[PDB]
């Protein structure tokens, strides 16, 4: 009790050095995040102009689509396998480990590798996101300034590393809240106390977000408009949807883990077969990125279309099935790029699909399938990555439909609950475990 | 400790099913309780209105039964606390916060009726106090109640059910589910050590209580502000200034509520009679003010949409702010059952609006709307005095639905905390628990 009384009176006094440095960490991460985003776009853009150059000869056209993405993919697979192996996959499990002081933060290597390697895989039009990359980039940047300014202590090492990855997520989704929430729901040391200053994470998240706003304002990543409200006698439909996500979550989790194994056998661990396999996958995506764009790329483009109920039921099933395939191929291959974002598109489609059935089964509820897309958007997050509070707040920050806060919270919680009860695990924790154990195996 | 981590990682997020289910019942009960409390406070304020109409002619006689009705109700509240449950005085949040540190008892058999009925008197009487604190403590106790009844053993259960209760308690008091969950993991939880509080379980309880509120309060928002204008990047610097202003006022306000506790204590010395009498004096003052200047009394939720819409004059805003500083301190520092959380929303809204008024006229090139500054400042006095900015922001967001102001809100709140820290201020709920906890081993 005596200690507590002392501690209470000393609560919320973060070292000003840690606060000021958090501001610079955020700023750099923001700018870096912007530069990454502009870069990816530029490359996808050039590929488009190349397809126009040869818009006539379909075979030739179907070739340079493959090659441009193949070459770009290989360049990314190489930069990872050669200079920074830790920069494979999302990057979140890695930074998560670094917070437990169980993985190293080699910023001198990861920063250029992830930035340029990711620039290739993403820009090639592979099914990967910016979230993971920017989060790892964010942490390394946070690590970088810690080193440069020689800030000593556990608090500083844990804080600056945290604000960086937070400000990294924020600047990748224009979601400041979701960024801060992700650090304290998933990223932080989950099994012990930590000296991460929340006030400091805030400051970093602000600056990076502000940086994003200077280069991206007036345009939202996802525009959905304002949808209809959700009656109380309609809420049970959302609990059901969450249950469906809840049982598919772990299954999808087994696949991404298992497909890592299968894809490993193809190259054995060899830098040549791996990069070659990489160009094969990347080439496939660039090909799909022309013959069926919905089956490739980030997937942010089909989200508003799905929510507006413009896809037919058949097209939705196609897109979902196809994108399960092309997501696993791209992420389980070890290519630099997160799976966080592509799960938004997966959830949105599964949600809309559910809404379509809900619309015709109960005309008395006067439903709109779009409300189920929004409920399902962060559901696969809630089910597979198991961070529902972050997913919900993220989806809210991106869709601005707060009147669906109850359906969203219900669907998400129904996802996590059923994921737990069917023996699934947090993917980022199940991956860090994979790596950490393999390290002492 | 790598080997342990690998084990722990693969065992992450597996909350005991008993704890999960029990969280669902805790949420439900807390919700129904919160609704009942809300309906009760309203009904009493309503009867008081009908009495003033009975005597709407004779102004002195009218100015009397306004005083008496509130005086009587106040005393009944001050009495129930001072006689059966002294821990039910004040907000109730520092107490539950203590119970999470296993440093304060949760006497639900006493607090539940005392807080519910005692707060029903102070709130219903028209005193300047909130529902948040009360429902939070009520929620915690209800959580504790089902723990005992079902004999659930373990630290996890004791900490979880106690947490989901106070979370689902805040949620049902503001119709703000996100804000409730966030308040537990930003402020309520044990701040200096690890804890076994299942977040998934706090979620379930928060859902149920919120849903319970939705069955009895749908279609009507606690605060309607409408959609306001956006905030340009070159205007953001105005919000950082606003935060700084909240940031230096926060601690000062904190000194007052603490200090006024001392001063008001001397009036009664600790005696149950002078105290209850002093209560009726304060309560009667509010019921009087609740008729001759209603903006200086009551919760304050009513003047929030009006201020945001820029319908008050600058002079009125200054008057309301000054007066409400006075009536808030008198009501909360007196130890009456009732929180200070919610009345800090009204104080912040006014101070914010006031800033916007000056901002509108100083920079017409920004094409400003003072309403955006009220919303920025609404959860700012929270951020500065209670030092829980992430909660206040998400709360204000949930109540006002103006997400395009998220950057100004975040900037103003963070500016409030930063300047609060740098000017030697302390979290009020932690500074109060400390006051109590130390006093507990100071009488030794």
């Amino acid at each position: 009790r005596r200690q507590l009384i002392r501690q209470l009176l000393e609560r919320d006094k973060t070292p000003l050095a840690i606060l000021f440095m958090a501001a610079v960490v955020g700023t750099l991460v923001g700018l870096a995040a912007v530069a990454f985003d502009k870069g990816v776009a530029w490359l996808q853009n050039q590929r488009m102009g190349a397809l126009v150059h040869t818009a006539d000869n379909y075979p030739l056209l179907l070739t340079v689509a493959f090659l441009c993405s193949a070459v770009l993919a290989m360049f990314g697979y190489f930069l990872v396998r050669k200079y920074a192996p830790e920069a494979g996959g999302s990057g979140i499990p890695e930074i998560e480990g670094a917070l437990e002081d169980q993985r190293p933060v080699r910023w001198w290597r990861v920063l250029p590798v992830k930035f340029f390697g990711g620039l290739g895989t993403l820009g090639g039009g592979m099914v990967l996101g910016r979230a993971g990359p920017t989060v790892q980039i964010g942490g390394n940047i946070g690590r970088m300034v810690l080193d440069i300014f020689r800030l000593k202590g556990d608090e500083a090492r844990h804080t600056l590393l945290a604000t960086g990855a937070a400000a990294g997520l924020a600047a990748a989704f224009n979601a400041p809240l979701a960024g801060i929430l992700f650090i304290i729901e998933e990223m932080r040391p989950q099994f012990r106390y930590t000296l991460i200053s929340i006030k400091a994470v805030f400051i970093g998240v602000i600056m990076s977000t502000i940086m994003y706003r200077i280069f991206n304002h007036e345009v939202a990543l996802i525009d959905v408009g304002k949808l209809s409200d959700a009656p109380l006698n309609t809420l049970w439909l959302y609990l059901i949807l969450g249950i469906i996500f809840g049982i598919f979550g772990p299954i999808f989790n087994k696949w991404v883990l298992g497909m890592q194994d299968l894809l490993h056998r193809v190259h054995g661990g060899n830098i040549t077969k791996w990069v070659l396999m990489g160009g094969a996958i990347g080439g496939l995506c660039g090909l799909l990125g022309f013959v069926a764009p919905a089956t490739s790329g980030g997937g942010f483009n089909l989200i508003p279309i799905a929510t507006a109920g413009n896809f037919s039921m058949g097209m939705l099933v196609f897109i979902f099935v196809a994108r399960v395939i092309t997501t696993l191929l791209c992420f389980s291959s070890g290519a630099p790029g997160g799976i966080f974002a592509p799960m938004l598109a997966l959830g949105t489609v599964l949600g809309t699909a559910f809404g379509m059935v809900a619309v015709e089964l109960f005309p008395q509820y006067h439903l709109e399938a779009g409300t189920f897309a929004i409920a399902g958007m962060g559901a696969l997050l809630a089910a597979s990555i198991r961070a529902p509070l972050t997913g919900i707040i993220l989806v809210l920050e991106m869709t601005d439909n707060y009147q669906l806060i109850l359906p969203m919270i219900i669907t998400g919680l129904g996802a996590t609950l059923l994921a737990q009860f069917t023996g699934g695990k947090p993917l980022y924790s199940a991956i860090l475990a994979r790596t950490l154990a393999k390290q002492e195996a």
Side-chain angles (χ1 to χ4, degrees), chain A:
Chain A
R1 173 196 286 180
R2 187 55 136 207
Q3 187 210 32
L4 182 54
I5 298 164
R6 156 64 175 176
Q7 285 179 310
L8 283 192
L9 299 166
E10 286 303 292
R11 184 169 162 244
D12 192 31
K13 301 181 77 173
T14 311
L16 191 142
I18 296 185
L19 294 180
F20 174 84
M21 287 299 154
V24 358
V25 171
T27 304
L28 303 188
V29 168
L31 297 180
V34 176
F36 181 84
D37 182 27
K38 300 281 143 288
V40 173
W42 184 87
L43 287 147
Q44 280 159 318
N45 170 74
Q46 302 304 321
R47 298 197 288 109
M48 233 102 169
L51 298 185
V52 165
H53 243 340
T54 74
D56 31 308
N57 197 340
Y58 191 73
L60 169 65
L61 191 213
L62 282 213
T63 299
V64 312
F66 183 93
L67 303 188
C68 286
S69 287
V71 170
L72 280 181
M74 289 188 302
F75 173 81
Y77 280 81
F78 172 67
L79 259 299
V80 175
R81 284 291 91 186
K82 187 62 177 181
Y83 306 90
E86 23 164 4
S90 194
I92 301 185
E94 211 61 70
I95 300 288
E96 243 163 24
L99 286 155
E100 297 276 21
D101 302 305
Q102 288 298 308
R103 291 292 292 198
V105 200
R106 320 213 304 265
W107 60 262
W108 50 94
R109 287 168 163 267
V110 181
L111 286 183
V113 165
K114 200 72 175 191
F115 184 86
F116 290 100
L119 224 29
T121 51
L122 275 255
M126 299 177 60
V127 188
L128 303 149
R130 302 154 151 79
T134 52
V135 160
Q136 181 171 25
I137 289 181
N140 287 249
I141 288 176
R143 176 85 222 191
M144 185 185 72
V145 336
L146 174 87
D147 290 340
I148 286 186
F149 292 79
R150 313 270 188 175
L151 301 153
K152 190 188 167 180
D154 274 339
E155 187 175 16
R157 185 178 78 264
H158 282 148
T159 293
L160 289 203
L161 186 59
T163 87
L169 187 80
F173 280 139
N174 195 10
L177 298 187
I180 311 170
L181 261 299
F182 192 51
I183 260 47
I184 69 183
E185 194 208 8
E186 177 69 19
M187 303 275 295
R188 60 161 273 201
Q190 207 63 38
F191 308 91
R192 71 173 184 278
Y193 180 80
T194 330
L195 326 89
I196 308 185
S197 178
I198 263 195
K199 176 184 289 190
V201 180
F202 237 76
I203 304 185
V205 162
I206 287 199
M207 304 297 306
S208 105
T209 302
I210 289 190
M211 289 304 116
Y212 174 93
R213 298 281 245 258
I214 302 190
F215 297 76
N216 287 271
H217 51 287
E218 317 260 312
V219 193
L221 303 176
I222 304 180
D223 201 345
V224 134
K226 168 62 66 175
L227 308 197
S228 51
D229 291 28
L232 293 185
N233 74 334
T234 230
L235 291 183
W236 68 284
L237 295 176
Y238 293 101
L239 177 54
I240 288 190
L241 177 64
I243 288 174
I244 295 174
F245 267 94
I247 75 174
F248 172 82
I251 297 189
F252 180 81
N253 267 11
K254 294 173 182 169
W255 293 354
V256 52
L257 285 171
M259 202 58 57
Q260 280 179 344
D261 299 344
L262 217 166
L263 280 182
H264 185 66
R265 297 180 190 170
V266 193
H267 47 73
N270 157 267
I271 203 175
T272 291
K273 302 178 179 178
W274 201 328
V275 167
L276 274 179
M277 188 192 65
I281 302 179
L284 175 63
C285 298
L287 180 95
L288 289 184
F290 177 84
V291 298
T295 69
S296 177
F300 278 177
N301 298 327
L302 50 77
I303 289 183
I305 304 184
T307 301
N310 289 336
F311 290 122
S312 66
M313 168 95 283
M315 188 64 174
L316 286 176
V317 174
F318 169 74
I319 292 176
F320 186 72
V321 166
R323 286 191 121 269
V324 169
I325 291 183
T326 64
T327 292
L328 293 178
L329 247 53
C330 289
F331 183 74
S332 313
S333 78
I339 199 185
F340 193 107
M343 291 197 295
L344 294 170
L346 277 179
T348 297
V349 170
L350 186 60
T352 300
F354 186 88
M356 294 228 165
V357 187
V359 156
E360 75 144 44
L361 280 187
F362 321 102
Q364 59 267 32
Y365 288 158
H366 293 76
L367 289 174
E368 183 183 21
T371 53
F372 294 90
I374 304 242
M377 192 158 103
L380 215 236
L381 284 173
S384 289
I385 204 261
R386 309 276 288 264
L389 180 56
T390 280
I392 287 162
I393 295 187
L394 172 67
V395 168
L396 174 70
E397 289 200 277
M398 298 204 302
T399 47
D400 206 337
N401 276 237
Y402 179 66
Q403 13 81 216
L404 297 179
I405 193 69
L406 243 65
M408 290 190 297
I409 287 178
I410 285 177
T411 303
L413 202 52
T416 347
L417 275 179
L418 266 271
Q420 164 170 337
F421 294 152
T422 55
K425 296 182 183 180
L427 227 215
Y428 290 168
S429 284
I431 283 187
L432 179 58
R434 273 280 213 84
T435 295
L436 230 52
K438 202 161 156 184
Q439 182 166 63
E440 63 166 318

